[PDB]
């Protein structure tokens, strides 16, 4: 029984945005942790086949030289927003000679998180984790399809976010360090993933005021995993 | 079933149920009447206090469209504001093009065509408003019109819009129009509004009275209602 | 419920239910309270969070040097009407080189939100504005609704369980008009301490206060310049 | 002028039962010639030609546009086209650019498709038709060809005297002209057949 | 205003497109064509759907539409949609000639029309074109050609074609009587006469109910021969004498 | 307007104590021809401000229309809020600038005089958008002729009374009748106070010609 | 014909110090051979640490000032903080180029403090270039003022003259002397001199008259 | 135009038409492709031809550049549209930057077009799935596939069309590094994979290769016959 | 205004003056003409100040977007092509712009020359500006491919000195940048009068 797609609920919410919040849940997990040393971040790739070449799946993409990101669930709706967010950060540094802070980036994205309509189509289906180091120190940011953007100190998303948030609130406090948070994230990863944790499953992305750019090539991941 | 949905469809017996449902939408609003005298038109709107809910001066249904024309709306409120803005714009176009004050017939016909044009299609809903329009001119006299949700616009001596509609015009028809100056009609409408719509479901109410005619020298404004306070000193003497 | 699909459809009882559903969407926000004296207008809201670790979703946002709004409901429509609000303020600030009175701004807000409530295929804006301002004739406390039936009040309160707030405001609306900033603001947050269950209140972590003054620019405060305002209270009764 | 940018001359002459159209061969940039084989007379169906003179850009452009509309017309209607119809088509095509005008002076010469009736007409750069009985000319050297055809024309002409008359007219009127020369092509057509002869003109 | 909307674009939950197949089953009725390319020429065959005695036949044409100098097309389906298509197709080929002054090759013509049809299959809810149609033609690069348009926008070159539902058995017959390039223009005509004699259930094939047009290669002409009726009559007599000769084997 | 058809002439305005007086004459000249000897070149805006202009009279009729409609709209808002004269000055400046940016100027030279909230106001608006405040304004040839009288008396004493201001305006209009070729002996004085806006009638001048008896 | 531009003139000066930025400007607004007024200050206070001056055609100066104030308010209502100086410079360059093909006839000088607390003067041109210099003089009396600041501030073309850092009250007597000396020969230098001083503690202003010629 | 949203989310978190338009891919012809290290190879199975007609028009493998190669599944018309737009895009890239067009760019273009096509107002999603094999600069063989969702996704061997689970299961037990040692063996590996797929009569086995410093060569179906013959000989040598 | 650029075995040299007049009147003496686009590109200032600054800044925008989309820094010819394409869409409207583009490539050295007339050519030596012919003379004296580092420094510095000695519009300070394989590096900022002292004796 097909109603108009821009119909609220008998209870109050909407429909299609709520169905988007449901559509997040099938996606792969991701974990980002704010630390005053810098923002660390982790994700799972969910490798399916051995024919599937592993280094091509993107989860952490690059918005600015100091603003990172991670995506979830649908890949390509996220790709549009990543491209556009990059464009708008370039417009800000151009017309202002300065760095668009991460909150202003995410305001610019959730301005049209919901412009879905028939004139002037569907709501987007991706949850995003935004990091980076602005002038306000490190920042970790989380949005949703509904544009309800909030700051989170260490948010975990997607399919395993219940036990991830719970066991994350077990281990987290305010004065953590970097590497402790990195292994604290990947312990949660290899409790919530399904396959054996190895060199090809996960990927990290850490950005620091000292380690100036988010840089994470392979096989330091090997050194981090053999430290478990 | 099926025939109550669109504002474009007809019925098996030949009427539009959208327009009917919109007509009885205005039926739940408060009673607002109007009446003209031989040199002016007097408005009056029953506004109700619940307990606090506002300040003596919000959302006044007595609008003021042109320099000599104002509204006395009742029904869905935001639609009445949009219609008042359209009426101000139309009087603006007339003043800008032909250079003189809008005759009330032309204003009512343009507004009636806009309301009727919103009834023709399925993209838009019909309006949920029914409002009054009064005026005065030295070469035209007093004119009082009335526009329903459908778009039928014609003239009255007296009218009433709201819950109490017949029982507010039971005693409109007991007044007369030739022998009255409007300064009697102010306290007449005042005493009757205090008479009708008893204390039963709502407890406190509040009165507004708009007022146009020769005594305002062609202007339209709210009464200095606090000045001469003419309702209440006879309204408390109207209970027996 | 074949009449409950669209905005266009009148009901056979005349109540277009998309507006009622948008009202219920306003009813699911956080609690907030706005109230004015003769010289100062104060609006106080309550913050909430998604979890423990995350920060609290902010409510009071700036508009102009003398206009500030509260909010309840959705945030995309909130920021949409927010952007329209700053734009319409700075337009007249550009053209006439004067500040806007609040009443014509809220009339423009109603005329803005009318069109998506009448045509087909647009939603009513789920929005919970509580507007405090200064024209030349003093403070104004307005509220909106998704039906664009904007009100002027002396004290309103919208959001979840906001009716007890209205009961507290009735038994002190006589006392409101005379007082200065400090006890006025603490009456507002005493409305907030009865919009809550009796064992978690406002421990510098969920409340925000925006005051506009005759010499004071509209300013938001959060937990730390609210810690001076939170002392000077007693406990709840037994 | 812009008409004297590339030279050009087109003559059409009505005979007794037949019609002859001729033009020059020279192409070049005001004083510099380029080639001796530039085509200015186009076939539009059988036993009906058109000649174009003036700026060569508009010559090739109008020729291709007319061929476009002509084939669309002859495919929408199975019959072949009457010459008045072609004249009106060229008039409408030129008049669509009333203020953006092409620089050309089309000359239509063809026979009747039903009878053996000849037909000649010419147009201006905005679309003014003109049907005559003797001759129409177009190009820079107008007055020369006017002198020739008002000097040498007879009403009832066998194709041999028609050929020799148009030959002498084109040769002499071109030889007095400067910017137009370098050979003559002559199309002499009739009910039965189509003849194309090239004359021994001065190559100077 | 959306409950009236007919949704002629959204996939069906069986797994295929829905309106597309029903346009195909609208192809299947009212029509039966084929042609036989097998050297020096190519032909088209057609059945009279309105063979009633009160027509005029004054058009000097029928199902065939000579769309250029060197291409025609046979129609099957709803007729006037194909008139919309033939007008647009003729105009496409003519604009190509306007653009290059060289005649139009037959596959980019076919793909232009296929993109037009797929443009109304893909987006909106518009009704799809219920017309399949043939193609004969000539080029500079391959010679004589045959093509099969479909309402999806799919096409495909053949050497012996088929549209109408009555002619699937004709494709069976075209395979059972397949030749490897042998169109002396009497063998292919007798084969086409034999096919339309068997597949249509019209007893003995009255020549007013059929239509045959050919396309031969001449140096400066590229003639399209929409041939007259007397040679069709003597072709039918030739084939019925050859069927009497062929059933001496029993 | 590319070519001004029917021009007015100079407008004079000067503040005084709790009010602004503005006076301009009543002549509509075409070329050299004093074609329209009874026209009004001062609009009495609602209650606090007042407008006078020069240049093309048709454009002044246009701005009269537009300003009248805007004032009517705010008076129909019913909020108790009016336009300050400085707001009108700002709006008019923006209007002239948007005219001249599109190479379609309104050929005018406007003076806005207003009194609101204790403070007098006297604003200037040019065709090109040049706009400022001044204690005494003078347009056209008035800036060459009656400007030094204003700046003469205002430098020796910065404030004035209403009688002194009106007398000074009368003298300046006398001088402009003396040495403007496009001038006329009929002018109207318009005045704003706290009591409202008042337009006096078509007054005239008393001239001297005793130099003509000198040969 | 209708000429769209007119030269109103004016003279704006700027001096970048170690921790201060002094911007001064005359207040005469004139046209041709007349005086429209003797009080019209060219300086404008944008933020708590930025003062802009605008000379040339006056209507474009007013329009540009109002647009800059609007975009300042837009930046504030988007990013919870005021702009820097260089951000305003980049934005103003984009604006001044955004009407390239119908240009502003406006000289622009922005003085203010950077985020380190040092002086920074960003000059401009009517079409939209800019550069970070220590001192500029814009307007009609530019050529009467640039070489003297080269002599005193820049220490150019001298021998055995050491480089002393420019103090405050020394810069003040410099500004007063250069406006008196330029007002002797210029026709556009006003009477009222409006001196704006931007420190790390707010904005100071100061009004010094001149000869009333 | 057509102001409507065709593709709505599900109540349980799907796009009906993106997940469901994969079925149209699932009911098309099969096509495999592997990369060797120096020679790339791909080809389609199941032409399901009428064995007695033309075949130059039904070619399911085309090219966009002299560097890049195609394959697809699903319905062929949407592939025709996407290939036309891809040709235009790669040549317009050659207009700008003077390189030969990288394969990753054209796959991102195809997937981006597909996603903004599914997102838009009332456009039916493309029920195809392409294979884009090319070897860009410094000779690196790479191969990507598409999806109706619009996810370019790099693999090492293919599994699309009818019964792709079986084919990927054969490639799973046939991931030998030895197979990509001899170019001839890689060709024979494609032939053996497609032989572990459909009839493989040696009629509907249309295969084309590129040795990364040349253009695509469509093989004449007698060489493929000798390839199948030597595959059957090695299968007999297995016993 | 006089700029030059020339490539050789060890990368690219770019030098320029710093005087930017207005008619007969000098505005400034320290106008940094070599506009720093990237850590691997260098653009110049050739006539128009606002136009060169704006369009090269827009080119930098496009290049940074290109890098974030391709994960690979753009080449020089691609950047010059984008600049020429953006400039051509305003032909005849009165843009004066004669800039140069320098940088390191996968191919190595890259030196292009982009006009407001839309001319785009590669090459080995270039010189733009009013007194550019003066730089052309002494540069095409001292040019070779097999040169040292300090030789190229002295060549470019002397070249700009001769140009500013003859031209009236050229002057101020001689900037000097050096494009390497890894990234560009500022060499020195030398005043004219110091060079006059150095080369007069």
Q: How far apart are CA D148 and CA D135, in angstroms?
A: 10
Q: How far apart are CA B172 and CA B192, in angstroms?
A: 9
Q: Which of F80, F88, F97 would best serve as a mutation to test chain C binding (most C beta carbons within 10 A)? A: F80
Identify all chain D residues contacting E98, using CB atoms and an 8 Å cutoff: 64-65, 67-68
Residue A88's domain is classified under what CATH number? 3.60.20.10
Q: How far apart are CA E136 and CA E44, in angstroms?
A: 8
Instruction: Kindly determine whether residue I53 and residue G128, on different chains, have CB atoms separated by under 8 Å.
Output: yes
Q: Which of residues 86-115 of I touch G (CB under 8 A)?
A: 93-94
CB atoms within 10 A of CB E21: 14
* CA-based nearest residue to F135, from F119, F126, F83: F119
Identify all chain A residues contacting I72, using CB atoms and an 8 Å cutoff: none
What is the SS3 assignment for F113?
strand
| CA A199 to chain centroid | 21
**Torsion angle of the four alpha carbons H176, H181, H185, H187, in this order, in degrees rounded to the nearest 10:** 100
DSSP summary character for residue B208 = E
Identify all chain F residues contacting B66, using CB atoms and an 8 Å cutoff: 72, 76
Identify all chain A residues contacting I58, using CB atoms and an 8 Å cutoff: 94
Diameter of chain D measured on Cα atoms: 47
Order across the sheet with A128-134: list the strands.
A69-70, A128-134, A137-143, A150-151
Min distance F87 CA to chain G CA atoms (Å): 14
Q: Which of I49, I54, I86, I196 would best serve as a mutation to test chain G binding (most G beta carbons within 10 A)? A: I54
Residue B155's domain is classified under what CATH number? 3.60.20.10
Q: Does A145 touch chain H (CB under 8 A)?
A: no
CA angle A181-A183-A184, nearest 5°?
A: 55
Q: Does B6 touch chain E (CB under 8 A)?
A: yes
Domains of chain H: 1-239 (3.60.20.10)
Length of chain I: 201
Q: Is F1 a catalytic residue?
A: yes
Identify all chain I residues contacting A84, using CB atoms and an 8 Å cutoff: none
Domains of chain I: 1-201 (3.60.20.10)
Instruction: Kindly determine whether residue A168 and residue C28, on different chains, have CB atoms separated by under 8 Å.
Output: no
Q: How far apart are CA H159 and CA H71, in angstroms?
A: 12
Which residues, including other chains, have CB under 8 Å from residue G27's CB and lie 6 or more apart? G37, G38, G39, G40, G41, G42, G190, G191, G192, G193, G194
Q: Does C97 touch chain G (CB under 8 A)?
A: yes
Domain of A199, in residue numbers: 1-228
List, in sequence order, every residue forming a beta bridge with D28; answer none if it has no partner: D33
B215 φ, ψ (degrees, to nearest 5) = -70, -25
Number of domains within chain B: 1
CB atoms within 10 A of CB F68: 15
Helices and strands, counts by H and E, chain H: 6, 8
| CA F166 to chain centroid | 14
Q: Concatenate the DSSP letters of all residues of chain G into one string.
A: ---S------EEEEEE-SS-EEEEEE--EEETTEEEES----EEEEETTEEEEEEESHHHHHHHHHHHHHHHHHHHHHHSS---HHHHHHHHHHHHHHTTTS---EEEEEEEE-TTS-EEEEEE-SSS-EEEESEEEEETTSTTTHHHHHHHTS-TT-SS---PPP-HHHHHHHHHHHHHHHHHH-SS--S-EEEEEEETTEEEEEEE-----
Q: How far apart are CA A186 and CA E153, in angstroms?
A: 52
The listed CATH number (3.30.565.10, 3.60.20.10, 3.60.70.12, 3.30.420.40) that belongs to domain F1-215: 3.60.20.10
CATH of domain C1-238: 3.60.20.10
F–C touching, 3+ CB–CB pairs within 8 Å = yes
**Strand pairing category for D19-24 and D27-29:** unpaired
Domains of chain G: 1-213 (3.60.20.10)
CATH of domain E1-250: 3.60.20.10
* CA-based nearest residue to G67, from B2, F97, E15: F97
State yes or no: I46 annotated in a binding site: no
Q: How far apart are CA I73 and CA I77, in angstroms?
A: 12
Which residues, including other chains, have CB under 8 Å from residue E244's CB and lie 6 or more apart? none
**Cα–Cα distance list, B228 to B190, B224, B225, B233, B234 (Å):** 12, 8, 7, 9, 11
* CA-based nearest residue to F45, from F106, F92, F105: F92
Unique residue bearing structure tokens 């500006």: I129
Chains touching chain B, criterion 3+ CB pairs below 8 Å: C, E, F
Q: Which two tokens stand for residue E170?
A: 């004709």
List, in sequence order, every residue forming a beta bridge with F136; answer none if it has no partner: F14
Instruction: Kindly determine whether residue D75 and residue E90, on different chains, have CB atoms separated by under 8 Å.
Output: yes
Length of chain D: 204
Number of domains within chain A: 1
Q: Tell me the domain boundaries of chain F.
A: 1-215
Q: How far apart are CA I127 and CA B131, in angstroms?
A: 79
* CA-based nearest residue to A63, from A111, A124, A105: A105
Q: Concatenate the DSSP letters of all residues of D141-176 into one string.
A: -HHHHHHHHHHH--SS--HHHHHHHHHHHHHHHHHH
Q: How far apart are CA C189 and CA F86, in angstroms?
A: 41
Q: Does F72 touch chain B (CB under 8 A)?
A: yes
CB atoms within 10 A of CB F37: 12
> Element (H or E) spanning E3, and its range?
none
Identify all chain H residues contacting I81, using CB atoms and an 8 Å cutoff: 96-98
Chains touching chain G, criterion 3+ CB pairs below 8 Å: A, C, F, I
Under the phi-then-psi rule, with left for phi > 0, alpha for psi from -120 to 50, and beta for the rest, what region is C161? Answer: left
Domain of B196, in residue numbers: 1-240
Chains touching chain H, criterion 3+ CB pairs below 8 Å: A, E, I
DSSP summary character for residue H155 = B
* CA-based nearest residue to D102, from D125, D134, D118, D79: D125
**Cα–Cα distance list, D194 to B203, D188, D197, E218 (Å):** 108, 6, 10, 20
Long-range contacts of D157-160 (CB under 8 A, 24+ apart): D157/D15, D157/D16, D158/D15, D158/D16, D159/D15, D159/D18, D159/D20, D159/D188, D159/D190, D159/D195
C67 φ, ψ (degrees, to nearest 5) = -125, 130
Out of I1, I2, I99, I164, pick the active-site residue: I1
Instruction: Kindly determine whether residue B52 and residue C173, on different chains, have CB atoms separated by under 8 Å.
Output: yes
Domains of chain D: 1-204 (3.60.20.10)
| CA D140 to chain centroid | 13
């Amino acid at each position: 029984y097909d109603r108009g797609v821009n119909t609220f609920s008998p209870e109050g919410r909407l429909f299609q945005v709520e169905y988007a919040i449901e559509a997040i849940k099938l996606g792969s997990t991701a974990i980002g942790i704010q630390t005053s040393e810098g923002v660390c971040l982790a994700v799972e790739k969910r490798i399916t086949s051995p024919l599937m070449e592993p280094s091509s799946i993107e989860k952490i993409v690059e918005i600015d030289a100091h603003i990172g990101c991670a995506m979830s669930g649908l890949i390509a709706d996220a790709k549009t927003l990543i491209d556009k967010a990059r464009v708008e950060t370039q417009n800000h540094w151009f017309t202002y000679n300065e760095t668009m802070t991460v909150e202003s980036v995410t305001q610019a994205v959730s301005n049209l998180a919901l412009q879905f309509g028939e004139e002037d189509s569907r709501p987007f289906g991706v949850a995003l984790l935004f990091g980076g180091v602005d002038e306000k120190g490190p920042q970790l940011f989380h949005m949703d399809p509904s544009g309800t953007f909030v700051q989170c100190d260490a948010r975990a998303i997607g399919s395993a976010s219940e036990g991830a948030q719970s066991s994350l609130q077990e281990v987290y406090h305010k004065s953590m360090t970097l590497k402790e948070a990195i292994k604290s994230s990947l312990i949660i990863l290899k409790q919530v993933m399904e396959e054996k944790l190895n060199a090809t499953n996960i990927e990290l992305a850490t950005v620091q005021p000292g380690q100036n750019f988010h840089m994470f090539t392979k096989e330091e991941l090997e050194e981090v995993i053999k430290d478990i | 079933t099926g025939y109550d949905l669109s504002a474009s469809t007809f019925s098996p017996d030949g009427r539009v149920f959208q327009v009917e449902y919109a007509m009885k939408a205005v039926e739940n609003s408060s009673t607002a009447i109007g009446i003209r005298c031989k040199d002016g038109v007097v408005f009056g709107v029953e506004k109700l206090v619940l307990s606090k809910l506002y300040e003596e001066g919000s959302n006044k249904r007595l609008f003021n469209v042109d320099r000599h024309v104002g509204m006395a709306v009742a029904g869905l409120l935001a639609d009445a504001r949009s219609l008042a803005d359209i009426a101000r714009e139309e009087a603006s176009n007339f003043r800008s093009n032909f250079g003189y004050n809008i005759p009330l017939k032309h204003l009512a016909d343009r507004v009636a065509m806009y309301v009727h044009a919103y009834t023709l299609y399925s993209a838009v809903r019909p309006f949920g408003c029914s409002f009054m329009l009064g005026s005065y001119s030295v070469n035209d006299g007093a004119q009082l019109y009335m526009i329903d949700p459908s778009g039928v616009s014609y003239g009255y001596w007296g009218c009433a819009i709201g819950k109490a509609r017949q029982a507010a015009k039971t005693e409109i028809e007991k007044l007369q129009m030739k022998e009255m100056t409007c300064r009697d009609i102010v306290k007449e409408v005042a005493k009757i509004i205090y008479i009708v719509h008893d204390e039963v479901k709502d407890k406190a109410f509040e009165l507004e009275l708009s007022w146009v005619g020769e005594l305002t020298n062609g202007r339209h404004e709210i009464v200095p209602k606090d000045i001469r306070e003419e309702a209440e000193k006879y309204a408390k003497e109207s209970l027996k | 419920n074949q009449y409950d699909n669209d905005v266009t459809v009148w009901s056979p009882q005349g109540r277009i239910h998309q507006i009622e559903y948008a009202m219920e969407a306003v009813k699911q926000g956080s609690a907030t309270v706005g109230l004015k004296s003769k010289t100062h207008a104060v609006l106080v809201a309550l913050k909430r969070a998604q979890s423990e670790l995350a920060a609290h979703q902010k409510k009071i946002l700036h508009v102009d040097n003398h206009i500030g709004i509260s909010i309840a409901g959705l945030t995309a429509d909130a920021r949409l009407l927010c952007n329209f609000m700053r734009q319409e303020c700075l337009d007249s600030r550009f053209v006439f080189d004067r500040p806007l009175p609040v009443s014509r701004l809220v009339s423009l807000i109603g005329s803005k939100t009318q069109i998506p409530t009448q045509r087909y295929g647009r939603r009513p804006y789920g929005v919970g504005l509580l507007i405090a301002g200064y024209d030349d004739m003093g403070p104004h406390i307005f509220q909106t609704c998704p039906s664009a039936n904007y009100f002027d009040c002396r004290a309103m309160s919208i959001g979840a369980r906001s009716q007890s707030a209205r009961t507290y405001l009735e038994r002190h609306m006589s006392e409101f008009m005379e007082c200065n900033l400090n006890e006025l603001v603490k009456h507002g947050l005493r409305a907030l301490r009865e919009t809550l269950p009796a064992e978690q209140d406002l421990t510098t972590k969920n409340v925000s206060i925006g005051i506009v003054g005759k010499d004071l620019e509209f300013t938001i405060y959060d937990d730390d310049d609210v810690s001076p305002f939170l002392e000077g209270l007693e406990e709840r009764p037994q | 002028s812009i008409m004297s940018y590339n030279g050009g001359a087109v003559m059409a002459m009505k005979g007794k039962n037949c019609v002859a159209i001729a033009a020059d061969r020279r192409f070049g940039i005001q004083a510099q010639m380029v080639t001796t084989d530039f085509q200015k007379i186009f076939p539009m169906g059988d036993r009906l030609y058109i000649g174009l003179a003036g700026l060569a850009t508009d010559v090739q452009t109008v020729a291709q546009r007319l061929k476009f509309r002509l084939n669309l017309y002859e495919l929408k209607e199975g019959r072949q086209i009457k010459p008045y119809t072609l004249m009106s088509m060229v008039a409408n095509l030129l008049y669509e650019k009333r203020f953006g005008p092409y620089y050309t002076e089309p000359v239509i010469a063809g026979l009747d498709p039903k009878t053996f009736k000849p037909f000649i007409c010419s147009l201006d750069l905005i679309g003014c038709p003109m049907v005559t009985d003797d001759f129409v000319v177009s190009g820079t050297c107008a007055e020369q060809m006017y002198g020739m055809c008002e000097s040498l024309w007879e009403p009832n002409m066998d194709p041999d005297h028609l050929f020799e008359t148009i030959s002498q007219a084109m040769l002499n009127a071109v030889d007095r002209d400067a910017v137009s020369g370098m050979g003559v092509i002559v199309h002499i057509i009739e009910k039965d057949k189509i003849t194309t002869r090239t004359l021994k003109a001065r190559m100077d | 205003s959306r409950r009236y909307d007919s949704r002629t674009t959204i996939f069906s939950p069986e797994g295929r497109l829905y309106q597309v197949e029903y346009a195909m089953e609208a192809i299947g009725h009212a029509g039966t064509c084929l042609g036989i390319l097998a050297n020096d020429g190519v032909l088209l065959a057609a059945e009279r759907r309105n063979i009633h005695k009160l027509l005029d036949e004054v058009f000097f044409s029928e199902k065939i539409y000579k769309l250029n100098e060197d291409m025609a097309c046979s129609v099957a389906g709803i007729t006037s949609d194909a008139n919309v298509l033939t007008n647009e197709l003729r105009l496409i080929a003519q604009r190509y000639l306007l653009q290059y002054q060289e005649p139009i090759p037959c596959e980019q013509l076919v793909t232009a029309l296929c993109d037009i049809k797929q443009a109304y299959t893909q987006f909106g809810g518009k009704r799809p074109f219920g017309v399949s149609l043939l193609y004969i033609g000539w080029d500079k690069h391959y010679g004589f050609q045959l093509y099969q348009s479909d309402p999806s926008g799919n096409y495909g070159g053949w050497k012996a074609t088929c549209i109408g539902n009555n002619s699937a058995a004709a494709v069976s017959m075209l395979k059972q009587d397949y030749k490897e390039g042998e169109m002396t223009l009497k063998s292919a005509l007798a084969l086409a006469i034999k096919v339309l004699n068997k597949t249509m259930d019209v007893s003995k094939l009255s020549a007013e109910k059929v239509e045959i047009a050919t396309l031969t290669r001449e140096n400066g002409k590229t003639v399209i021969r929409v041939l007259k009726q007397k040679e069709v009559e003597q072709l039918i007599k030739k084939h019925e004498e050859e069927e009497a000769k062929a059933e001496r084997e029993k | 307007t590319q070519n001004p058809m029917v021009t007015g002439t100079s407008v004079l305005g000067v503040k005084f104590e709790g009010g602004v007086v503005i006076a301009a004459d009543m002549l509509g000249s075409y070329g050299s021809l004093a074609r329209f000897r009874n026209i009004s070149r001062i609009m009495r805006v609602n209650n606090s401000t007042m407008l006078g202009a020069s240049g093309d009279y048709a454009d002044f009729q246009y701005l009269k229309q537009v300003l009248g409609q805007m004032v009517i709209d705010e008076e129909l808002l019913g909020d108790g809020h009016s336009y300050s004269p400085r707001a009108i000055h700002s709006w008019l400046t923006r209007a002239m600038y948007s005219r001249r940016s599109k190479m379609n100027p309104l050929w005018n030279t406007m003076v806005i005089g207003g009194y609101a909230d204790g403070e007098s106001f006297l604003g200037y608006v040019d065709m090109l958008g040049v706009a400022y405040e001044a204690p005494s304004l003078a347009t056209g040839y008035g800036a060459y002729l009656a400007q030094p009288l204003l700046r003469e008396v205002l430098e020796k004493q910065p404030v004035l009374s209403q009688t002194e201001a009106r007398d000074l305006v009368e003298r300046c209009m006398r001088v402009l009748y003396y040495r403007d070729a496009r001038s006329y002996n009929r002018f109207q004085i318009a005045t704003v106070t706290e009591k409202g806006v008042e337009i006096e009638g078509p007054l005239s001048t008393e001239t001297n010609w005793d130099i003509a008896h000198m040969i | 014909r209708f000429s769209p531009y007119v030269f109103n003139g004016g003279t704006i000066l700027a001096i970048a110090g170690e921790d201060f930025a002094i911007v001064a400007s005359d207040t005469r607004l004139s046209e041709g051979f007349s005086i429209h007024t003797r009080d019209s200050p060219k300086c404008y206070k944008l933020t708590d640490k930025t003062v802009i001056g605008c000379s040339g055609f006056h209507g474009d100066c007013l329009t540009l000032t109002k647009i800059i104030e609007a975009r300042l308010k837009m930046y504030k209502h988007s990013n919870n903080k005021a702009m820097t100086t260089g951000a305003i410079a980049a934005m103003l360059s984009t604006i001044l180029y955004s009407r390239r093909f119908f240009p502003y006839y406006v000289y622009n000088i922005i003085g203010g403090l950077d985020e380190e607390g040092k002086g920074a003067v960003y000059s401009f041109d009517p079409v939209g270039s800019y550069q970070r210099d220590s001192f500029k003089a814009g307007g009609s009396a530019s050529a009467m003022l640039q070489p003297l600041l080269d002599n005193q501030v820049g220490f150019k073309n001298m021998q055995n003259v050491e480089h002393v850092p420019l103090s405050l009250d020394r810069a003040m007597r410099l500004v007063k002397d250069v406006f008196i000396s330029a007002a002797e020969r210029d026709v556009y230098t006003g009477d009222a001199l409006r001196i704006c001083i931007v420190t790390k503690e707010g904005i100071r202003e100061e009004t010094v008259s001149l000869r009333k010629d | 135009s057509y102001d409507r949203a065709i593709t709505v989310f599900s109540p349980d978190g799907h796009l009906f038409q993106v997940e469901y338009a994969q079925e149209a891919v699932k009911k098309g012809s099969t096509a495999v492709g592997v990369r060797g290290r120096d020679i790339v190879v791909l080809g389609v199975e199941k032409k399901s031809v009428a064995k007695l007609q033309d075949e130059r028009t039904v070619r399911k493998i085309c090219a966009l550049d002299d560097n890049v190669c195609m394959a697809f599944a699903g319905l062929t018309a949407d592939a025709r549209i996407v290939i036309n737009r891809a040709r235009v895009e790669c040549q317009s890239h050659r207009l700008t930057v003077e390189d030969p067009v990288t394969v990753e760019y054209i796959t991102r273009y195809i997937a981006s077009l597909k996603q903004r096509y599914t997102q838009s107002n009332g456009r039916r999603p493309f029920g195809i799935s392409a294979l884009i094999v090319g070897f860009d600069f410094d000779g690196t063989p790479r191969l990507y596939q598409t999806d109706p969702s619009g996810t370019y996704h790099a693999w090492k061997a293919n599994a699309i069309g009818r019964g792709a689970k079986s084919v990927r299961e054969f490639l799973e037990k046939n991931y030998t590094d030895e197979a990509i040692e001899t170019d001839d063996l890689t060709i024979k590996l494609v032939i053996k994979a497609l032989l572990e797929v459909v009839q493989s009569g040696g009629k509907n086995i249309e295969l084309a290769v590129m040795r990364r410093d040349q253009s695509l060569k469509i093989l004449n179906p007698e060489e493929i016959e000798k390839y199948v013959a030597e595959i059957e000989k090695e299968k007999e040598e297995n016993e | 205004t006089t700029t030059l650029a020339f490539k050789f075995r060890h990368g690219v040299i770019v030098a320029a003056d710093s005087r930017a007049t207005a008619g007969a009147y000098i505005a400034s003496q320290t106008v940094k003409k070599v506009i720093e686009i990237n850590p691997y590109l260098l653009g110049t200032m050739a006539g128009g100040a606002a136009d060169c600054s704006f369009w090269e800044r827009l080119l930098a925008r496009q290049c940074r977007i290109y890098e974030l989309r391709n994960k690979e820094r753009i080449s020089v010819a691609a950047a010059s092509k984008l600049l020429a394409n953006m400039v051509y869409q305003y032909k005849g409207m009165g843009l004066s712009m004669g800039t140069m583009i320098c940088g390191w490539d996968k191919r190595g050295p890259g030196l292009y020359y982009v006009d407001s007339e839309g001319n785009r050519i590669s090459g080995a030596t270039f010189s733009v500006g009013s007194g550019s012919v003066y730089a052309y003379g002494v540069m095409d004296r001292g040019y070779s491919y097999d040169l040292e580092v300090e030789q190229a420094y002295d060549l470019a510095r002397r070249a700009i000195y001769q140009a500013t000695y003859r031209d009236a519009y050229s002057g101020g300070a001689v900037n000097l940048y050096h494009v390497r394989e890894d990234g560009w590096i500022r060499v020195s900022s030398d005043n004219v009068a110091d060079l006059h002292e150095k080369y007069s004796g």
